[PDB]
Amino acid sequence: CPLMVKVLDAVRGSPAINVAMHVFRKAADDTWEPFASGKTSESGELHGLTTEEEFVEGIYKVEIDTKSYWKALGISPFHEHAEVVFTANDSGPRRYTIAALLSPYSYSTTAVVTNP
Amino acid sequence: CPLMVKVLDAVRGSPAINVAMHVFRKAADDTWEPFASGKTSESGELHGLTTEEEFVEGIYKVEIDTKSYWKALGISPFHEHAEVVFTANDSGPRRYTIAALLSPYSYSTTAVVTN
Amino acid sequence: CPLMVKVLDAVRGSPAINVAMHVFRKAADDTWEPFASGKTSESGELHGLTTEEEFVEGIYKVEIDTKSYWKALGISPFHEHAEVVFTANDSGPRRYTIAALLSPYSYSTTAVVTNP
Amino acid sequence: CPLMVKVLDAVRGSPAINVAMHVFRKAADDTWEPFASGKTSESGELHGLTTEEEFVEGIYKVEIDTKSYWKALGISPFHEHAEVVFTANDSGPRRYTIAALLSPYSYSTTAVVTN
Numbered sequence A, C: 001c002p003l004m005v006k007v008l009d010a011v012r013g014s015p016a017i018n019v020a021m022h023v024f025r026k027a028a029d030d031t032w033e034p035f036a037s038g039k040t041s042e043s044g045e046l047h048g049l050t051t052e053e054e055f056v057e058g059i060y061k062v063e064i065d066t067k068s069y070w071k072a073l074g075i076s077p078f079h080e081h082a083e084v085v086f087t088a089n090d091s092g093p094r095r096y097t098i099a100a101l102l103s104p105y106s107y108s109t110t111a112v113v114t115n116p
Numbered sequence B, D: 001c002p003l004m005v006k007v008l009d010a011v012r013g014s015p016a017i018n019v020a021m022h023v024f025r026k027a028a029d030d031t032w033e034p035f036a037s038g039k040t041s042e043s044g045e046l047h048g049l050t051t052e053e054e055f056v057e058g059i060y061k062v063e064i065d066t067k068s069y070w071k072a073l074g075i076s077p078f079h080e081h082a083e084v085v086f087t088a089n090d091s092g093p094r095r096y097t098i099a100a101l102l103s104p105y106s107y108s109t110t111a112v113v114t115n
């Protein structure tokens, strides 16, 4: 469906497995409303967060719990989390893949936006 | 200078100049209280945000207005901003350089943490 | 199969399509021998470069023609190409995904190495 | 200083120190002729590789020995090295900073190209 997140580990060269993340939508009143959540699979992917009709226009935030991921590996990393904040579907529906690449003191994030 | 931010532009191969950003400290009630801000210099750098005495342990957020930067260049961006959230000084004062590399649909951020 | 390359465009937020690349293997005599080549698909992927039995231990180089990609979009980029040089299969066979993320003056590259 | 290389370590959040690298210029017969080398300082920087007069147009390669760096830290790396291949000075002399960010299974490289 319309929103997928793929998370890689740049130290081990592997998908980043069991990484928790929470998705929020900015409300009319400017607050962050809980939208969805899940944890990455063995392939570092999280699918099924939302549907085409629920995923309307708006500003979305994906908060990826990268600190817990590193802590479980014994590492105290720099970032509390990796955030990804973006306007979605403002020219009509699109399908978003959020790619995140994680190191203890660095994190990249990239979007692949395609038309269904 | 305990906190410095350096921003580069991966499309133009240059420092990212006049990029605004705000720094926040997480309050006891878990809200973000803004306490410093600035814009990058002609070398893409922002210095002088805080002092050693002020920069106590806590959770800090740097919100970099990448969307305005790309809009000023006439380039469509993906992100609303780039946010850098970290716990500072957890075993003593350190000097933090946040290095941010910007593309319209991608950014990376790195910390260089010294003495 | 054992070697896949996925190339993304960080300016347009899209797969980088029709990107040419050449794979070389370092020979016993230290020269770079042509190993395989291909161009990325509409999904920014190149598959079928090699087989499990051909892809023996050795030092491999993937030379991705990123300059031509940017030039065809009107852009004069920094890099002549993005190279990816690595020892493969030295603890037994593995499956390698090379992920490359391209901007006119920057390029990241990451490997996902998994056991079949 | 027409060419500077700055290398950071994404695992330790620090400059990458004592990283060796070699610089080559592509010859007329398409072989690479080595002409400069050095290792990064305690701030992860390598200066003084060439001079304005020597650094003429051509295709240059910087080969960064990331594998030795990771081996010295006891960390398994993926890449044999990180190579930065570019045409220099194509419309006049510029000042190039190559910024490299290193992880064991990933690296990124960026050019900051000025006047």
Ligand SMILES: Cc1cc(OCC(=O)O)cc(C)c1Cc1ccc(O)c(C(C)C)c1
Binding pocket: A006, A007, A008, A097, A099, A100, A101, A108, A109, A110, A112, C006, C008, C097, C099, C100, C101, C108, C110, C112
């Ligand atoms: C977008 C994407 C999807 C994907 O699906 C799974 C697979 O093909 O195995 C597999 C890969 C490797 C990518 C590309 C990707 C995925 C994550 C990632 O961090 C990066 C860096 C360039 C930031 C690239």
Ligand SMILES: Cc1cc(OCC(=O)O)cc(C)c1Cc1ccc(O)c(C(C)C)c1
Binding pocket: B006, B007, B008, B097, B099, B100, B101, B102, B110, B112, D006, D008, D097, D099, D100, D101, D108, D109, D110, D112
């Ligand atoms: C190129 C550079 C120059 C620099 O001078 C600032 C100082 O004097 O501390 C300080 C730093 C940290 C960098 C490195 C840098 C600066 C920004 C940046 O986005 C990147 C990414 C490639 C990771 C690296």
